[PDB]
Structures are given as C-alpha cells and as structure tokens.
Write a protein that binds this ligand. Structure first.
Ligand SMILES: NC(=O)c1ccc[n+]([C@@H]2O[C@H](COP(=O)([O-])OP(=O)(O)OC[C@H]3O[C@@H](n4cnc5c(N)ncnc54)[C@H](O)[C@@H]3O)[C@@H](O)[C@H]2O)c1
Length: 137
C-alpha cells in the first residue's frame, strides 16, 4: 500500500536531539509511546516518530504465513529463543531480555516492517526501526 497510508504516530524522549534512526544502538532503533507524557519520563527532548508500516503482534503470530521459519533463521536455529521473540514480552529464563527485543526488531526488518509491537512496564510500546521518521518536538 501507498507509503504513509498505515502510519502510526508515537513519541520518544531522549537527552539527545535525534536526526534519524541509525541501524545502531542496543536495539537497532528507538522505542515509541502513545502518550507524550510517557516519552518525557525517558528524556528531556521530545521527538515524534512516524512508522510507515508497523507490525502488530497479532499480525506476526496469526496473519503472516511462515513467520516462524523467519524467526528461526534469525534465532540461529535455536527454537527456544525464536519462540520467545515471536511474542511481545521478549522473555526467557536463558537469554537477555534486551537481546530478545533486538532480535524481535530484526524479525520485522526481515519481514519488511518498520516497527514492532512490544511489551514493557508502560504496557504496549513499539520498537521503531530505520525507515521511520524521527523529528524533535
Ligand atoms: N525512551 C522511550 O521513549 C521509551 C518508550 C517506551 C519504552 N521504553 C522502554 O525503555 C527501555 C529502554 O529504552 P531506551 O529508550 O531507554 O533505550 P536506550 O536509552 O538504551 O537507547 C536509546 C537511546 O540512544 C539514543 N539513540 C539515538 N539514535 C538511536 C538509534 N538510532 N538507535 C538506538 N539508540 C539511539 C537515543 O537518545 C535513545 O535515548 C526499553 O525496554 C523500553 O521498553 C522507552
């Protein structure tokens, strides 16, 4: 679909002023919240992130044919972590939670998306990957 037709609007708080979303950092992107108030609790400078096409958790597990094999390829064949990154919580007793979150971001890039539904203390947040637009205030 024409780019922008599915865009969702999120906010990111940081100490920096973000120009673009580099393929770098712990997660390979930025986390966005639905409420400006939530983003400000994470930083002083507020940003607007716009993901042209986000990947909902439902669409991941239920509407995308053979996403499991793609999650397997990014998990190095370890079917225990691939199972963990198909789900928002990104939880397993054997792996680092944030590396699970990063690998979940890799999934969406592989599947052709630019943000992924995530779970966190706030509730649902989104890992916004390169492809989104970030702009201050
Ligand atoms: N910061 C937020 O707005 C926000 C929103 C929702 C959830 N969270 C939660 O907080 C936890 C950690 O999130 P975080 O924001 O503090 O991560 P983080 O602070 O460790 O890394 C992100 C920081 O690095 C900088 N950065 C700039 N460009 C970047 C890029 N292209 N890739 C990576 N970093 C970049 C940003 O200033 C950003 O503040 C996550 O588990 C998430 O659940 C944070």
């Amino acid at each position: 679909g024409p780019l922008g037709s599915m865009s969702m609007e999120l906010f990111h708080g940081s100490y920096e002023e973000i120009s673009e979303i580099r393929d770098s950092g712990v997660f390979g992107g930025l986390f966005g919240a639905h409420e400006k108030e939530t983003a400000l609790s994470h930083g002083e400078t507020l940003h607007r992130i716009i993901s042209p096409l986000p990947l909902t958790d439902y669409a991941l597990n239920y509407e995308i044919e053979s996403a499991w094999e793609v999650a397997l390829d990014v998990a190095g064949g370890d079917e225990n972590v691939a199972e963990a990154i198909m789900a928002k919580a990104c939880e397993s007793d054997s792996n680092d939670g944030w590396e699970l979150q990063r690998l979940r971001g890799v999934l969406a890039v592989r599947l052709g998306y630019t943000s992924v539904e995530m779970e966190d203390e706030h509730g649902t947040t989104w890992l916004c990957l390169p492809g989104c637009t970030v702009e201050k205030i």
